[PDB]
């Protein structure tokens, strides 16, 4: 074990969006001491992610925007991007649904129509700390690499079919991790993001512990030697992961970490 990667919503975070800081801080100290790395792999924005680790932000690494942005020890390592035409197309397609609310996620900030329901903005504000109102999604001066849709992830099968033809796979629908849908560049998932750090560190999946609970954690869990499904994880995630742990309201993620430090089952 050389790397521990964790999801946030429904994983490392309890339902109230908090975690045992004193406990994780002591653990992290032991992980650092042992040379084991800590990575947060999440669909959330880099800026909201670091808000949860204000004291460790420059030490640990992040795989943000579901794989679109990767920071290694404080430095930006990679970021995907849609071509100007690809984004115009996706945005044009989304705007055809004059009932749909969505967020355009960029390298510098996320963006949302200034004509979006107050309730939608508040929810998105909890996943994107840099959220700017705009008049025209087409006039955004930033590189874009992901979208977040105001639609329950329950409708994913439907979104796949609708966008299959309309976008021909310019982007694929996956769960945001907090009940909604994210449109990502195919291939730019958490596993792909984590792979960039492993290459950088010269480590392999064989040394990776990964913890998750929803659909967007699929390839991350399948990739890792030590894959953990949260007690509250979805069915297909529980199946994919080799191991299990308590739910997010009972420090499931931290128990996996503990097991690593004390060498309890799978580590022994
Ligand atoms: Mg989650």
58 is in an annotated binding site: no
Distance 211 CA to ligand 1 centre (A): 9
Pick from 162, 186, 210: which residue ends a domain? Answer: 186
Do 227 and 102 lie in one domain? The reply is no
Q: Residue 167's domain spans which residues?
A: 81-186
d(CA 213, CA 190): 13
**Any residues with CB less than 8 A from the CB of 137 and at least 6 apart, and which?**
91, 94, 95, 104, 111, 113
Choose, from 7, 153, 182, 217, the residue flagged as catalytic.
7
Q: Which of 88, 78, 80, 9 is nearest to 41 (CA)?
A: 9
User: Do 164 and 215 fall into the same domain?
Assistant: no
Same structural domain for residues 38 and 86? no
- The verdict on 212 and 163 lying in the same domain is no
On whether 9 is known to bind a ligand per the annotation, the reply is yes
Rounded CA gap, 13 and 18, in Å? 5
The response to whether 113 counts as a known ligand-binding position is no
Q: At what angle do helices 252-262 and 21-33 cross, to 10 degrees?
A: 30
Distance 135 CA to ligand 1 centre (A): 31
173 cis-preceded (ω within 30 degrees of 0): no
Mark which of 152, 186, 220 sits at the end of a domain: 186
152 CA distance to ligand 1 middle (Å): 14
From 170, 186, 202, the end of a domain falls on: 186
Q: Are 183 and 147 in contact (CB under 8 A)?
A: yes
Q: And the tokens for 169? A: 């796979």
Q: Is 171 annotated as a binding residue?
A: no
Other CB atoms within 10 Å distance of the CB of residue 204 = 13
- Per the structure block, which two tokens stand in for 186? 């195919």
**Same domain membership, residue 191 and residue 71:** yes
Is residue 7 annotated as part of the catalytic site, yes or no? yes
| PDB resolution in Å | 2.2
In angstroms, what is the span from residue 139 Cα to ligand 1's centroid? 32
Give the count of domains, the chain.
2
Distance between CA atoms of residues 82 and 247, nearest Å: 36
HEC states along the chain? Answer: CCEEEECHHHHHCCCCCCCCHHHHHHHHHHHHHCCCEEEEECCCCHHHHHHHCCCCCCCCEEEEHHHCEEEECCEEEEECCCCHHHHHHHHHHHCCCCCCCEEEEECCCEEEECCCCHHHHHHHHCCCCCEEEECCHHHCCCCEEEEEEEEEHHHHHHHHHHHHHHCCCCCEEEECCCCEEEEECCCCCHHHHHHHHHHHHCCCHHHEEEEECCHHHHHHHHHCCEEEECCCCCHHHHHHCCEECCCHHHCHHHHHHHHHHHCCCCCC
The answer to whether the CB of 224 falls within 8 A of the CB of 210 is: yes
CB-based contacts of 49-57 (< 8 A; 24+ apart in sequence): 49/8, 51/129, 52/8, 52/13, 52/19, 55/25, 56/28
């Amino acid at each position: 074990v050389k790397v521990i990667v964790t999801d946030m919503d429904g994983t490392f975070l309890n339902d109230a969006k908090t975690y045992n800081q004193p406990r994780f801080m002591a653990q992290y100290q032991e992980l650092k001491k042992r040379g084991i790395k800590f990575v947060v792999a999440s669909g959330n924005q880099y800026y909201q992610l670091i808000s949860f680790f204000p004291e460790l932000k420059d030490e640990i690494s992040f795989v943000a925007e579901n794989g679109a942005l990767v920071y290694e020890h404080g430095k930006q390592l990679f970021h995907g991007e849609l071509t100007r035409h690809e984004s115009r197309i996706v945005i044009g397609e989304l705007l055809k649904d004059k009932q749909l609310n969505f967020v355009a996620c960029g390298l510098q900030s996320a963006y949302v129509s200034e004509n979006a329901p107050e309730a939608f903005v508040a929810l998105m504000a909890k996943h994107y700390h840099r959220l700017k109102p705009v008049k025209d999604y087409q006039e955004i001066d930033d590189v874009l690499f992901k979208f977040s849709l105001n639609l329950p992830d329950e409708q994913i099968p439907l979104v796949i079919d609708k966008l299959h033809v309309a976008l021909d796979g310019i982007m694929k629908p996956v769960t945001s991790g907090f009940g909604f849908i994210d449109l990502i560049i195919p291939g730019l998932h958490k596993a792909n993001g984590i792979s960039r750090l492993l290459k950088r560190w010269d480590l392999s999946p064989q040394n990776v512990v990964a913890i998750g609970d929803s659909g967007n954690d699929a390839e991350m869990l399948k990739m890792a030697r030590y894959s953990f499904a949260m007690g509250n994880a979805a069915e297909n995630i529980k199946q994919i992961a080799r191991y299990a742990t308590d739910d997010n309201n009972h420090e499931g993620a931290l128990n996996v970490i503990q097991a690593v430090l004390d060498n309890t089952y799978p580590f022994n």
